[PDB]
RNA sequence: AUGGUUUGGCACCUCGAUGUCGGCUCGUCGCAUCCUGGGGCUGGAGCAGGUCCCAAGGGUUGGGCUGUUCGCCCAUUAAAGC
RNA sequence: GUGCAGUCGCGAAGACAACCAGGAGGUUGGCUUAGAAGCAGCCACCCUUGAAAGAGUGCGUAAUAGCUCACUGGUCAAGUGA
């Protein structure tokens, strides 16, 4: 699971659920790649886990990049206690995803395997994505 | 047609020989000797004896050239033939040696000629995992 | 039968139909019969 | 140490002839060897890393042919991976069934490029029979990588 | 070797805005902008289907001349703006050309072939950044990876570059790499 | 499949039949790979049996010096070609026939006339 | 994602009174069916099952311990439903 | 599912579908298992008579065989497929 190593502020927004994403939009890494087309917090557990569907159904050979990192707390309060006394600790790390935004990206040989293992990806993944190409 | 690399003198394992040609239906103990018979000018052969019948179940066969895969080991050395080509090559096969892979099968091989039937045997060692140059 | 709201091929043969508004995939193989539900 | 690797010398009998961890030079390659200063001859090969800082030691060198056919092999591993999810990790298991295997340059890493690479040791230093065990520990059907480690 | 500049009709824009633009692209047309040394910007509204057409036959980096009002103006296509989601030609930035100009383009690279099975070929660079005339841009620049062992770093100035063609990147620009 | 491979096919049809002499089309039945490539290597080092079209061979025809034939390929088609005279590899596709009696020798083109009783049988065989 | 039965969150009616757990009695409803009924697949030989689908007509025991619901246990049962 | 708008591959030089006939040798290309072969499993993933023959499409397969295939030719005959 990703995380990073430190943040200025744990304690943190919502990451704000609105625009077309502006940067990511396109691939620049690879051949293929997962394009959003919803909002969505994308958490640790979601990468991963797409990651390794990818790395599963396609093995040694190609390579795949992340370009999202869930650099973003998300608090959560504990359980069977009170509104109030305070703002949760972070327990989930997310990252905002807007939509056109590219979130995977790999270079294989056949695009059928390429494809199938992304679109494995995308089940994994909690919103509505897209199979793109590094050509257009 | 039970197509078989059938090994030297050996006991009838199960796998390779018997029953592969007891499922067609040719007997177990007399194609062994039928066919020494004939290896004994010949002797040293693995050939793809596709075992082969008549109406009312008896042994025809017309023996066949040995294998060009396992030939290639043999007169490589070492009997062991590798898998791997193209980025390994063992041991450069000579000229000569390819050459009376062509003789031997011009007889009971589908090539045309003698360099038809090196350039056969090239994709077979292709395939296989030894040089053939 | 699986009655599963995800019916899909599971080979070559299973082919997808749409019998009386549902979604039936049939088969030689009867182990790969399918219907939406 | 003097029982099995050595007995090449041409000029006397008596050998202190040690096998320097450099390109693992026991198959019957051209080589030489460099009398190691304090610590017997180190027995190189003509392809070896450390070969041009040595023969820039020019003086403390002495002819070898080496072909003492009875005797031991330095070893040689390759690269090849697992998988790590309850399948094709454990197939290192099913392929080491059928042959024994010393620990040679072993590496776990899955945040990598797209495999758990786990770079595979080996017990086969053979010229003519590398593609058969490469064929035997191939069952992962994502074999793009083949090559052995020097 | 030359391109042959392909036809396309521009319309003048009237109302300028994006108003008049989404109801142009709801229209099926394509706002642009023919700008250069021209040092007098037209507004034009082009055709989508065509120009789209023209784009993915000739590529981006594409010559083409504009029935502009009758008068048959040379122009190359400057940059892009695509929409994400639709990928929908949103705008199109075009350049005044004239024969022998040597404009500065980006251009696609491809790599193509193959290489040892036990490697793997990773793309660094989409383009490669050139100068040509601008009757002569390719349409792309090609680069083989037959026969290219691990630890090949192709890089730009290891290209096959045309006649007339002047790289302005860098030869350190790594384009491809070839590893396990 | 493509219609510049049927031009192509056309073309080489039309040029090797104005280079080799005899052409024997047959109507293929009753064969086998392995069967019809060993006795094919054996008969054929001065001749070459392959297939034919319907309309390629009509298209051919029409390009070359067997113009008026346009009925004799409703059904499979096995030319054979000869490039000296079919009398050796002639004969050798006669026992074939009446070896496997499938095979059909449709006939030919040796010179004007298409086939009967008189010269295509005797020439092959005999 | 359902549901709204659990622990909760909110504190919207009720603090010039909406009586609480469990049991007894009386039931009624839903089906997410425990039995009975019908069926598909099975790594279903058969007996017996597993899993899924349809099905709510009827039936769905008596006792030991515990205030207990629940649960464990005893004997039974076609079954001892939620 | 259907309609619309397209795009691409193929197509009366007969397409896709159906019906008739053929549908490999080398060869088991090699490793691995008692075996490895058109098909436990895997490495490479060739050439050759030739239309077409896949390192074989699968079944059947103890390995094979037999079975049909992909594919080739034909009979009718334009839309067909993605």
């Given at each position: 699971?990703?995380?990073?190593?430190?943040?200025?502020?744990?304690?943190?927004?919502?990451?704000?659920?609105?625009?077309?994403?502006?940067?990511?939009?396109?691939?620049?890494?690879?051949?293929?790649?997962?394009?959003?087309?919803?909002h969505?917090?994308?958490?640790?557990?979601?990468?991963?886990?797409?990651?390794?569907?990818?790395?599963?159904?396609?093995?040694?050979?190609?390579?795949?990049?992340?370009?999202?990192?869930?650099?973003?707390?998300?608090?959560?309060?504990?359980?069977?206690?009170?509104?109030?006394?305070?703002?949760?600790?972070?327990?989930?790390?997310?990252?905002?995803?807007?939509?056109?935004?590219?979130?995977?990206?790999?270079?294989?040989?056949?695009?059928?395997?390429?494809?199938?293992?992304?679109?494995?990806?995308?089940?994994?993944?909690?919103?509505?994505?897209?199979?793109?190409?590094?050509?257009? | 047609?039970?197509?078989?690399?059938?090994?030297?003198?050996?006991?009838?394992?199960?796998?390779?020989?018997?029953?592969?040609?007891?499922?067609?239906?040719?007997?177990?103990?007399?194609?062994?000797?039928?066919?020494?018979?004939?290896?004994?000018?010949?002797?040293?052969?693995?050939?793809?004896?596709?075992?082969?019948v008549?109406?009312?179940?008896?042994?025809?066969?017309?023996?066949?050239?040995?294998?060009?895969?396992k030939?290639?080991?043999?007169?490589?050395?070492?009997?062991?033939?590798?898998?791997?080509?193209?980025?390994?090559?063992?041991?450069?096969?000579?000229?000569?040696?390819?050459?009376?892979?062509?003789?031997?099968?011009?007889?009971?091989?589908?090539?045309?000629?003698?360099?038809?039937?090196?350039?056969?045997?090239?994709?077979?060692?292709?395939?296989?995992?030894?040089?053939?140059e | 039968?699986?009655?599963?709201?995800?019916?899909?091929?599971?080979?070559?043969?299973?082919?997808?139909?749409?019998?009386?508004?549902?979604?039936?995939?049939?088969?030689?193989?009867?182990?790969?019969?399918?219907?939406?539900? | 140490?003097?029982?099995?690797?050595?007995?090449?010398?041409?000029?006397?009998?008596?050998?202190?002839?040690?096998?320097?961890?450099?390109?693992?030079?026991?198959?019957?390659?051209?080589?030489?060897?460099?009398?190691?200063?304090g610590?017997?001859?180190?027995?190189?090969?003509?392809?070896?890393?450390?070969?041009?800082?040595?023969?820039?030691?020019?003086?403390?060198?002495?002819?070898?042919?080496?072909?003492?056919?009875?005797?031991?092999?330095?070893?040689?591993?390759?690269?090849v991976?697992?998988?790590?999810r309850?399948?094709?990790?454990?197939?290192?298991?099913?392929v080491?069934?059928?042959?024994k295997?010393?620990?040679?340059?072993?590496?776990?890493?899955?945040?990598?490029?797209?495999?758990?690479?786990?770079?595979?040791?080996?017990?086969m230093?053979?010229?003519?029979?590398?593609?058969?065990?490469?064929?035997?520990?191939?069952?992962?059907?994502?074999?793009?990588?083949?090559?052995?480690?020097? | 070797?030359?391109?042959?500049?392909?036809?396309?009709?521009?319309?003048?824009?009237?109302?300028?805005?994006?108003?008049?633009?989404?109801?142009?692209?709801?229209?099926?047309?394509?706002?642009?902008?023919?700008?250069?040394?021209?040092?007098?910007?037209?507004?034009?509204?082009?055709?989508?289907?065509d120009?789209?057409?023209?784009?993915?036959?000739?590529?981006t980096?594409?010559?083409?001349?504009?029935?502009?009002?009758?008068?048959?103006?040379?122009?190359?296509?400057?940059?892009?703006?695509?929409?994400?989601?639709?990928?929908?030609?949103?705008?199109?930035?075009?350049?005044?050309?004239?024969?022998?100009?040597?404009?500065?383009?980006?251009?696609?690279?491809?790599?193509?072939?193959?290489?040892?099975?036990?490697?793997?070929?990773?793309?660094?660079?989409?383009?490669?950044?050139?100068?040509?005339?601008?009757?002569?841009?390719?349409?792309?620049?090609?680069?083989?990876?037959?026969?290219?062992?691990?630890?090949?770093?192709?890089?730009?100035?290891?290209?096959?570059?045309?006649?007339?063609?002047?790289?302005?990147?860098?030869?350190?620009?790594?384009?491809?790499?070839?590893?396990? | 499949?493509?219609?510049?491979?049927?031009?192509?096919?056309?073309?080489?049809?039309?040029?090797?039949?104005?280079?080799?002499?005899?052409?024997?089309?047959?109507?293929?039945?009753?064969?086998?790979?392995?069967?019809?490539?060993?006795?094919?290597?054996?008969?054929?080092?001065?001749?070459?049996?392959?297939?034919?079209?319907?309309?390629?061979?009509?298209?051919?025809?029409?390009?070359?010096?067997?113009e008026?034939?346009?009925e004799?390929?409703?059904?499979?088609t096995?030319?054979?070609?000869v490039?000296?005279?079919?009398?050796?590899?002639?004969?050798?596709?006669?026992?074939?026939?009446?070896?496997?009696?499938?095979?059909?020798?449709?006939?030919?083109?040796?010179?004007?006339?298409?086939?009967?009783?008189?010269?295509?049988?005797?020439?092959?065989?005999?």
């Amino acid at each position: 699971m990703l995380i990073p190593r430190k943040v200025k502020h744990r304690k943190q927004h919502h990451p704000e659920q609105r625009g077309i994403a502006s940067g990511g939009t396109s691939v620049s890494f690879g051949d293929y790649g997962i394009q959003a087309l919803e909002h969505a917090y994308i958490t640790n557990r979601q990468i991963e886990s797409a990651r390794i569907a990818i790395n599963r159904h396609i093995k040694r050979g190609g390579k795949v990049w992340i370009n999202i990192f869930p650099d973003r707390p998300l608090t959560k309060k504990p359980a069977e206690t009170r509104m109030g006394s305070g703002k949760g600790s972070p327990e989930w790390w997310v990252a905002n995803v807007k939509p056109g935004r590219v979130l995977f990206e790999l270079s294989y040989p056949d695009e059928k395997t390429a494809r199938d293992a992304l679109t494995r990806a995308i089940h994994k993944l909690p919103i509505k994505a897209r199979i793109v190409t590094r050509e257009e | 047609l039970i197509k078989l690399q059938i090994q030297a003198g050996q006991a009838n394992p199960a796998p390779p020989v018997g029953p592969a040609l007891g499922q067609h239906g040719v007997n177990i103990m007399e194609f062994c000797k039928a066919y020494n018979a004939a290896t004994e000018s010949q002797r040293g052969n693995v050939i793809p004896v596709e075992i082969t019948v008549y109406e009312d179940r008896s042994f025809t066969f017309a023996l066949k050239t040995p294998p060009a895969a396992k030939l290639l080991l043999k007169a490589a050395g070492v009997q062991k033939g590798s898998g791997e080509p193209h980025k390994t090559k063992v041991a450069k096969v000579t000229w000569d040696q390819v050459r009376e892979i062509a003789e031997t099968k011009k007889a009971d091989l589908n090539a045309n000629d003698i360099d038809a039937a090196a350039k056969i045997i090239a994709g077979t060692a292709r395939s296989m995992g030894i040089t053939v140059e | 039968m699986k009655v599963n709201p995800s019916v899909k091929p599971i080979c070559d043969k299973c082919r997808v139909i749409r019998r009386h508004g549902r979604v039936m995939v049939i088969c030689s193989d009867p182990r790969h019969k399918q219907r939406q539900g | 140490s003097n029982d099995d690797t050595g007995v090449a010398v041409p000029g006397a009998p008596g050998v202190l002839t040690k096998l320097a961890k450099c390109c693992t030079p026991v198959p019957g390659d051209t080589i030489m060897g460099f009398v190691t200063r304090g610590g017997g001859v180190s027995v190189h090969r003509t392809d070896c890393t450390n070969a041009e800082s040595l023969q820039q030691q020019s003086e403390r060198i002495i002819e070898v042919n080496w072909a003492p056919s009875p005797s031991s092999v330095f070893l040689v591993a390759i690269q090849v991976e697992a998988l790590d999810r309850h399948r094709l990790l454990s197939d290192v298991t099913r392929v080491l069934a059928d042959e024994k295997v010393n620990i040679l340059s072993a590496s776990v890493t899955t945040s990598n490029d797209r495999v758990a690479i786990s770079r595979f040791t080996f017990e086969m230093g053979d010229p003519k029979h590398l593609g058969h065990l490469l064929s035997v520990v191939r069952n992962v059907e994502g074999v793009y990588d083949v090559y052995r480690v020097t | 070797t030359a391109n042959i500049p392909n036809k396309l009709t521009a319309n003048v824009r009237t109302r300028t805005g994006k108003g008049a633009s989404r109801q142009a692209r709801r229209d099926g047309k394509v706002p642009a902008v023919l700008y250069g040394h021209g040092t007098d910007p037209q507004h034009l509204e082009l055709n989508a289907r065509d120009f789209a057409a023209v784009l993915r036959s000739h590529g981006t980096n594409a010559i083409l001349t504009l029935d502009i009002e009758g008068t048959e103006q040379l122009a190359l296509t400057k940059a892009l703006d695509v929409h994400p989601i639709r990928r929908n030609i949103q705008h199109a930035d075009l350049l005044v050309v004239q024969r022998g100009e040597k404009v500065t383009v980006e251009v696609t690279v491809l790599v193509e072939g193959d290489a040892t099975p036990g490697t793997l070929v990773t793309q660094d660079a989409n383009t490669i950044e050139i100068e040509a005339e601008a009757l002569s841009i390719p349409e792309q620049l090609t680069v083989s990876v037959e026969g290219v062992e691990a630890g090949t770093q192709i890089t730009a100035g290891q290209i096959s570059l045309p006649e007339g063609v002047n790289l302005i990147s860098d030869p350190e620009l790594l384009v491809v790499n070839v590893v396990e | 499949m493509a219609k510049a491979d049927k031009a192509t096919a056309v073309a080489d049809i039309a040029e090797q039949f104005k280079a080799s002499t005899a052409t024997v089309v047959t109507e293929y039945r009753g064969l086998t790979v392995a069967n019809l490539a060993e006795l094919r290597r054996a008969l054929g080092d001065s001749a070459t049996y392959t297939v034919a079209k319907n309309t390629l061979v009509k298209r051919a025809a029409s390009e070359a010096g067997i113009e008026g034939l346009d009925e004799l390929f409703a059904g499979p088609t096995a030319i054979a070609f000869v490039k000296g005279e079919a009398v050796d590899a002639a004969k050798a596709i006669k026992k074939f026939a009446k070896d496997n009696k499938a095979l059909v020798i449709k006939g030919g083109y040796m010179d004007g006339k298409a086939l009967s009783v008189a010269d295509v049988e005797k020439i092959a065989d005999l």
